[PDB]
């Protein structure tokens, strides 16, 4: 029981971490593809 | 090169009224010969290192 | 005469006369299979006559192909064709097909397959032709007298530790 409980705790922590890392990796990939276009502002007026 | 460019120009119907202009670009990938590119039509008559 | 329909109800071409003529002009019986393939592709399923023509071509052809093919057997090809016809096409072989098989068995000297086909014809068909049965019996007697009834190695005495298990 002690060994299985330790494995259960370890597995849940790893699963949470892996899921969060996967989501953040997807978010970073989405952010990277985004490109900043030309700014249409009165640059001289400054 | 001029003859090839003119022949390609004749084939293209869209460029019938367009004037022909020749622009020279140096390519280090070819050692002998020449190539012509006009409106996407590319003719290769060159050779490289053996 | 009557239009035939496929599994989904689509009509299938029934004029299979030209294909039979093509089958009856082949040199090697493997080319007969090509004609059947062309028939199937052209939505012209073979009928009983086409299978009998193919069996005749198998019996009357010199070999399977222009170049020899190892372990080629006319009997196996015809039996496979009959299995296809009866099972995957729902067509009962007639007397002609079994007579062709029996003729092949007699011609090739296989007098045991001859007995099996003789029993088959006696059971399903209205008996086996007397000539074929007599020829098969003659082949069996010739094999028996010459001592080639069974392979020689099978008659060799063996033992628990005298058998070579490859």
């Amino acid at each position: 029981q002690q060994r299985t409980s330790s494995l259960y705790n370890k597995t849940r922590q790893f699963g949470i971490t892996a899921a969060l890392i996967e989501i953040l990796s997807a978010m970073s990939s989405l952010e990277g593809n985004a490109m900043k276009g030309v700014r249409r502002n009165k640059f001289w007026e400054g | 090169a001029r003859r090839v460019a003119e022949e390609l120009h004749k084939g293209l119907k869209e460029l019938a009224d367009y004037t022909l202009v020749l622009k020279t670009v140096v390519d280090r990938t070819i050692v002998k010969g020449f190539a012509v590119e006009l409106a996407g039509q590319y003719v290769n008559k060159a050779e490289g290192q053996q | 005469a009557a239009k035939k329909y496929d599994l989904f109800g689509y009509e299938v071409d029934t004029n299979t006369a030209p294909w039979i003529e093509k089958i009856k002009k082949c040199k090697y019986y493997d080319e007969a299979g090509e004609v059947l393939v062309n028939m199937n592709v052209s939505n012209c399923p073979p009928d009983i006559a086409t299978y009998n023509a193919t069996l005749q071509c198998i019996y009357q052809s010199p070999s399977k192909q222009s170049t020899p093919v190892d372990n080629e057997s006319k009997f196996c090809a015809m039996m496979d064709l009959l299995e296809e016809m009866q099972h995957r096409n729902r067509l009962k072989p007639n007397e002609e097909s079994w007579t062709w098989v029996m003729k092949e068995c007699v011609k090739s000297g296989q007098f045991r397959l001859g007995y099996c086909i003789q029993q088959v014809m006696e059971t399903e068909c209205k008996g086996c032709p007397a000539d074929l049965v007599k020829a098969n019996e003659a082949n069996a007697q010739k094999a028996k007298t010459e001592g080639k009834e069974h392979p020689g190695h099978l008659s060799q005495q063996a033992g628990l530790f005298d058998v070579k298990v490859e």
Binding site: - | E7 | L7, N71, A77
Partner: protein
């Protein structure tokens, strides 16, 4: 009268096995999913596949060959056509790439075709004999079926598929070429040495005459590994659309997924589960949907798929493994514990299933398999919880399922019938393989001069088709089959099992043990 190509831009960036192009202003432009040629030299080109068409005009390319020659700033020509590869009977017996280039050994088919329509198929009713008693009986496979081969590393996934390919050599040589089964062995991300060994093994048995190998080794770019299954099935679809039957083997889809994930990630595709691309299911889904059984109106040809998939520690809960399992019409699960326990092939009958069922079985095999399934189910139920008939015969059936090479249909069906009708009740479980070897490769009745059968003998290999036509439980063959089995059982018991049970000497015991082990690997 010039061979004018269609230049569409230049090579901008190179990141490993993928590249990005920049279109020259005022050019025709390239079409999606088409092939392009990168002019690495005035006379040499490197193939590539269009994958992305961005808003900026840049083009994502998947390099296919001559990657080392690709440099930034080189011209790119657009062919304007999808990928087509050579197809025909002239490719059999050769090793080729996904692009169709032949690999030296020591008609054009489109690679992006669609699967047959709903009304273009017919029910699976033609069996594809793998040669293994366990699979042929408990896991029927029919032509036009997708059967997954899932398991762990070093469990026989490749061996069973290669045996299935080899098992067709003997059949193809006898029956007409109309019903012959052609094989397309696709190696994906495997070692080059393994490909050579498999080629030599196929050549030894003469399977190259009916088989072609498509290889994308580990040293090749991911693009070729990603396209290998599609090119292989395309080569196999040539025979399907012409009234012929083919067998396609994918070894293995696990590595194709890795290659596709690499390509997608490098080309800035959003990662999904386990970093795989979102549309990773659709890849295999459209790959395996192209294997079907065409209706009689379209010729009646078929393609049979045997995709192979690897698991980790017998974990079938993985991502791609689940996707492939949810696509195929069945699965042969090879268990590691059974493999190490001496059961080979390690087919886990409990976890294996064929959704086609008995429809993909010959009339001769139908009754034997139907009774065998019930006997094995009862044996497993009782074993998990008294030598009853089900328990006496279940153990011998399990003993008969151990094989090293594919078995001829006549031998396998005869042995299964003998074990089914209690002819092996008096035979010890350890001696079942020796009994089967004597039955197949020997004739005790002829040896002892007690054989009165007229035609039914195990050395008459032509009886295989007669058995397949009429079945064993028919008046034509049943009487002689029973007589032969009775004579063989009596002679075997008397002249062999009495002596085998009387061995005590260490030399004789070792000799008998070696004999039994050899028999296990001989039949």
């Amino acid at each position: 009268f010039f061979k004018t190509t269609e230049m569409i831009g230049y090579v901008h960036s190179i990141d490993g096995t993928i590249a990005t192009l920049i279109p020259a202003p005022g050019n025709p432009g390239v079409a999606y999913n088409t092939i392009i040629q990168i002019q690495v030299s005035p006379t040499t080109f490197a193939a590539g596949l269009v994958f992305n068409l961005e808003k900026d005009g840049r083009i994502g390319i998947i390099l296919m060959d001559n990657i080392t020659e690709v440099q930034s700033g080189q011209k790119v020509m657009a062919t304007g056509q999808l990928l087509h590869i050579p197809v025909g009977a002239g490719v059999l017996g050769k090793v080729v790439n996904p692009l169709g280039h032949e690999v030296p050994v020591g008609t054009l088919g489109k690679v992006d075709t669609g699967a047959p329509n709903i009304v273009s198929r017919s029910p699976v009713n033609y069996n594809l004999l793998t040669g293994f008693k366990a699979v042929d009986t408990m896991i029927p496979i029919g032509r036009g079926q997708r059967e997954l081969i899932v398991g762990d590393r070093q469990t026989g996934k490749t061996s069973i598929a290669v045996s299935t390919i080899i098992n067709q050599v003997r059949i193809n040589q006898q029956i007409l070429s109309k019903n012959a089964v052609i094989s397309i062995y696709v190696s994906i991300g495997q070692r080059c040495s393994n490909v050579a060994r498999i080629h030599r093994l196929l050549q030894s048995y003469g399977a190259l005459r009916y088989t072609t190998v498509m290889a994308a080794t580990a040293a090749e770019p991911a693009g070729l590994q990603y396209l290998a299954p599609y090119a292989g099935v395309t080569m196999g679809e040539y025979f399907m659309n012409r009234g012929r039957h083919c067998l396609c083997v994918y070894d293995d889809l696990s590595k194709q997924a890795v290659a596709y994930r690499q390509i997608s990630l490098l080309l800035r595709r959003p990662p999904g589960r386990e970093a795989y691309p979102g549309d990773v299911f659709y890849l295999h889904s459209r790959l395996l949907e192209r294997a079907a059984m065409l209706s009689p109106g379209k010729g009646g040809g078929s393609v049979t798929a045997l995709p192979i998939v690897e698991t980790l520690s017998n974990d079938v809960t993985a991502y791609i493994v689940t996707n492939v399992i949810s696509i195929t019409d069945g699965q042969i699960y090879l268990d590691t514990k059974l493999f190490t326990g001496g059961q080979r092939p390690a087919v886990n009958i409990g976890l294996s299933v064929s959704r086609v069922g008995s429809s993909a079985q010959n009339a001769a095999m139908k009754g034997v398999a139907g009774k065998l399934k019930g006997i094995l189910a009862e044996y497993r139920k009782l074993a998990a919880d008294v030598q009853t008939i089900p328990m006496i015969r279940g153990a011998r059936f399990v003993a008969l399922f151990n094989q090293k090479q594919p078995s001829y249909f006549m031998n396998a069906i005869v042995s299964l019938y003998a074990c089914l009708n209690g002819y092996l009740d008096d035979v010890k479980v350890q001696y079942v393989k020796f009994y089967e070897y004597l039955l197949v490769h020997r004739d005790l009745g002829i040896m002892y001069g007690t054989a009165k059968n007229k035609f039914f003998y195990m050395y008459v290999q032509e009886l295989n088709y007669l058995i397949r036509f009429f079945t064993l439980n028919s008046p034509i063959l049943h009487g002689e089959l029973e007589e032969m089995l009775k004579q063989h059982t009596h002679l075997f018991l008397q002249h062999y099992q009495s002596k085998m049970n009387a061995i005590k000497s260490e030399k004789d015991v070792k000799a008998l043990k070696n004999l039994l082990y050899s028999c296990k690997r001989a039949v």
